[PDB]
Amino acid sequence: MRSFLNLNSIPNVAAGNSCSIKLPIGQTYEVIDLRYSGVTPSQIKNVRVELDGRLLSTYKTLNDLILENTRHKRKIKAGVVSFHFVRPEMKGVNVTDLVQQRMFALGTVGLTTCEIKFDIDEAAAGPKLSAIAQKSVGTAPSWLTMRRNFFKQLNNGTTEIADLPRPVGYRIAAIHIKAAGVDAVEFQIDGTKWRDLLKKADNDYILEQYGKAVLDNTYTIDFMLEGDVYQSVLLDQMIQDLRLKIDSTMDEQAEIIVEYMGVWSRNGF
Amino acid sequence: MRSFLNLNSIPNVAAGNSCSIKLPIGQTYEVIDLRYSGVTPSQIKNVRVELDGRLLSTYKTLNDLILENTRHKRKIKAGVVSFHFVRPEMKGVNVTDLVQQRMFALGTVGLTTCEIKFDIDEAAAGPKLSAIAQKSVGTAPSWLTMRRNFFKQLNNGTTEIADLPRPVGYRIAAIHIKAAGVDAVEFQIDGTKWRDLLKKADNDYILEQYGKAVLDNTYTIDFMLEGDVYQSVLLDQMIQDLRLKIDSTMDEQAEIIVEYMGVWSRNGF
Amino acid sequence: MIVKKKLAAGEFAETFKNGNNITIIKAVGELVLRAYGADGGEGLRTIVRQGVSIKGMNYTSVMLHTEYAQEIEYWVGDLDYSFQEQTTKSRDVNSFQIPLRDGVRELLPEDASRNRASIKSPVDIWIGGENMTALNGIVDGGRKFEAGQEFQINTFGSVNYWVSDEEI
Ligand SMILES: [Ca+2]
Numbered sequence: 227m228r229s230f231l232n233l234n235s236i237p238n239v240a241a242g243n244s245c246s247i248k249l250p251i252g253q254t255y256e257v258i259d260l261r262y263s264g265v266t267p268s269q270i271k272n273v274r275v276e277l278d279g280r281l282l283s284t285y286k287t288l289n290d291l292i293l294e295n296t297r298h299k300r301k302i303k304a305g306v307v308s309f310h311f312v313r314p315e316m317k318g319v320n321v322t323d324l325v326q327q328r329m330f331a332l333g334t335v336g337l338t339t340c341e342i343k344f345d346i347d348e349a350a351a352g353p354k355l356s357a358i359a360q361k362s363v364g365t366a367p368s369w370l371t372m373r374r375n376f377f378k379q380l381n382n383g384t385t386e387i388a389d390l391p392r393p394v395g396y397r398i399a400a401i402h403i404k405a406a407g408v409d410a411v412e413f414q415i416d417g418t419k420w421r422d423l424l425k426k427a428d429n430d431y432i433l434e435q436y437g438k439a440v441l442d443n444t445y446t447i448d449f450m451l452e453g454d455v456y457q458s459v460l461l462d463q464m465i466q467d468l469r470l471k472i473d474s475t476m477d478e479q480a481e482i483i484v485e486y487m488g489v490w491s492r493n494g495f
Numbered sequence: 496m497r498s499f500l501n502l503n504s505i506p507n508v509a510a511g512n513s514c515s516i517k518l519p520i521g522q523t524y525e526v527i528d529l530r531y532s533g534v535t536p537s538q539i540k541n542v543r544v545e546l547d548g549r550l551l552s553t554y555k556t557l558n559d560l561i562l563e564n565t566r567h568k569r570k571i572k573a574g575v576v577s578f579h580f581v582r583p584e585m586k587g588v589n590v591t592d593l594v595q596q597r598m599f600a601l602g603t604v605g606l607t608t609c610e611i612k613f614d615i616d617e618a619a620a621g622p623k624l625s626a627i628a629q630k631s632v633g634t635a636p637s638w639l640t641m642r643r644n645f646f647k648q649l650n651n652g653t654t655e656i657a658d659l660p661r662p663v664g665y666r667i668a669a670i671h672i673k674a675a676g677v678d679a680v681e682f683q684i685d686g687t688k689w690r691d692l693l694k695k696a697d698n699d700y701i702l703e704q705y706g707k708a709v710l711d712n713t714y715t716i717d718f719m720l721e722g723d724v725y726q727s728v729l730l731d732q733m734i735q736d737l738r739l740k741i742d743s744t745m746d747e748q749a750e751i752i753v754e755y756m757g758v759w760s761r762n763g764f
Numbered sequence: 765m766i767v768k769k770k771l772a773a774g775e776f777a778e779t780f781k782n783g784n785n786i787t788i789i790k791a792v793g794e795l796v797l798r799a800y801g802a803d804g805g806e807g808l809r810t811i812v813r814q815g816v817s818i819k820g821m822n823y824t825s826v827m828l829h830t831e832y833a834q835e836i837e838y839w840v841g842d843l844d845y846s847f848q849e850q851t852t853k854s855r856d857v858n859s860f861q862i863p864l865r866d867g868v869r870e871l872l873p874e875d876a877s878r879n880r881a882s883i884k885s886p887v888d889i890w891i892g893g894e895n896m897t898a899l900n901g902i903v904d905g906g907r908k909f910e911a912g913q914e915f916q917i918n919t920f921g922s923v924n925y926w927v928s929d930e931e932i
């Protein structure tokens with residue numbers, strides 16, 4: 227049996243304020259529903275999920291969490307944005323789908339602090355935020371999704387990005403290139419071309435082919451289209467080159483979103 | 496990890512030409528995305544999937560592949576038509592859903608030739624065709640879907656079709672009766688009425704009840720509505736009668752589509 | 765190491781391969797409104813709008829986020845220990861008279877010891893830095909102080925004057 231709780235009131239919710247959603251340790255957080263009003267998702271900046279003071283996932287703005295959910299075609303409702311720790315799209319290969327999905331839940335056992343920090347923009351009309359938690363029996367943090375932010379310059383022509391962090395033992399579920407002039411992209415590991423120079427229209431067709439929604443000004447490289455976690459990129463301690471070849475038409479700075487995965491460690495990624 | 500490749504250019508793509516998509520042997524083809532322009536799907540006639548020169552699946556026109564995907568409510572996009580070897584609707588009974596779906600993938604190991612032949616109509620404006628392959632590790636052809644074409648005269652009253660091929664060890668996933676005046680149909684094996692004389696409206700209701708889309712001028716007899724492969728007709732060597740009783744209102748020529756299934760054999764069905 | 769940081773509009777990424785100045789005091793320079801970041805294993809953020817002394821963290825590359833495109837270049841000198849303090853105080857006074865002659869001439873020399881000068885000219889006098897010229901009796905790069913006006917200069921560098929173009 228799961229428990230649906232109305233989280234404690236968020237302290238000091240005001241424009242230009244730096245607030246935090248301190249989660250009580252002991253149980254497992256499958257989903258966290260954040261209700262907002264008097265402020266836009268884009269006005270909720272620097273969203274950071276911290277476990278024991280360390281960064282797990284990061285969102286430039288709350289709007290990126292809305293887009294993250296939209297991509298998987300999850301239920302979107304105005305005035306509310308959810309933190310899906312449990313991945314509903316997961317499919318089991320040697321285990322049940324339910325086990326593969328729940329395996330991403332935010333367990334807090336052994337944790338000292340679990341926080342969701344963020345900054346409220348100064349332009350916020352009259353910010354009002356509350357949270358509800360869908361919890362289950364306590365478990366260690368274990369397998370978690372770690373959304374990381376990276377900024378790189380794209381040229382009009384061909385740009386290559388090979389300096390992406392490769393935490394050993396971790397995996398890569400997907401890579402999202404946020405740019406308005408990306409025509410095609412190619413992904414390779416150690417010379418091996420896992421993703422040919424696929425045109426945007428072709429890449430976007432495959433995405434939609436798997437029930438995903440194409441995000442505006444974004445080139446998504448989904449490594450878990452089938453929902454199989456074993457299809458994701460395994461950051462082998464032996465990989466020599468993890469490269470991305472981007473064919474752009476504009477000269478801009480792209481925001482590269484990398485969805486990492488791995489067993490959370492107090493001294494890990 | 497899967498590999499998305501931009502297949503080699505299709506040789507001699509022109510109106511009235513007979514082209515072919517020669518697939519490189521070695522790996523497994525889960526899906527093949529065929530992009531088309533300057534030609535209609537109906538202008539791409541006699542589509543044949545051949546393994547080692549032998550026929551696997553046949554489509555009168557590329558439009559039949561579009562309808563095949565539409566029926567399962569798969570993502571349809573104008574300018575592109577996919578060959579879904581892996582059946583996304585499959586559900587596992589003693590294995591995972593993923594295993595049951597991937598089991599239909601087009602493995603090429605041990606093959607000498609893998610081709611997708613077709614003829615471009617003479618009226619084609621300015622045919623342009625390209626293909627992309629979603630591949631995975633190599634496997635034998637193994638369990639494959641074998642789409643077969645049959646033409647039979649349907650009377651105004653009652654017609655019976657009992658001369659459908661019954662390859663031993665093979666199965667029948669579904670039967671599609673392409674006619675405009677079919678009121679009701681009855682299916683029986685050895686006297687046993689597995690499908691009562693069901694009215695079109697009633698049959699179509701059950702189809703939609705399982706997330707399927709009803710095709711125009713078609714009476715579909717889906718034996719895998721639940722996605723369970725073991726619900727399909729098992730063509731036992733002992734079966735004495737496999738009959739179809741069609742109640743039509745028109746005198747016409749029907750195109751009977753039979754979706755067979757079985758382990759591919761170089762000297763089999 | 766003393767390193768440049770210039771502007772234009774978008775993100776900048778100056779990644780010199782050696783964070784010797786990791787566990788080190790940064791003498792970072794800052795204009796108007798920016799955001800920065802620390803990349804040395806972990807990807808971090810930073811926001812700072814005034815000249816500040818930073819402490820040590822890990823660094824292989826620097827992230828440079830931009831809000832205002834048209835701010836100004838800086839030199840973020842990262843050093844193990846960086847302490848700079850000295851204004852004075854003046855102990856000595858010396859009073860004397862300068863010889864005002866023709867054309868642009870030096871009023872005061874560069875002199876590291878000078879703190880302050882209080883000056884009064886008996887004639888209108890144009891005062892400026894090294895750019896001051898007076899081609900044809902017209903002073904450019906100067907400003908006038910009036911005859912009898914007491915004024916002060918608190919620099920330690922050259923100052924120049926002009927009063928007249930008459931040789932005799
Ligand atoms: Ca977990």
Ligand SMILES: [Ca+2]
Nearest residue numbers: 600636637638
């Ligand atoms: Ca197969």
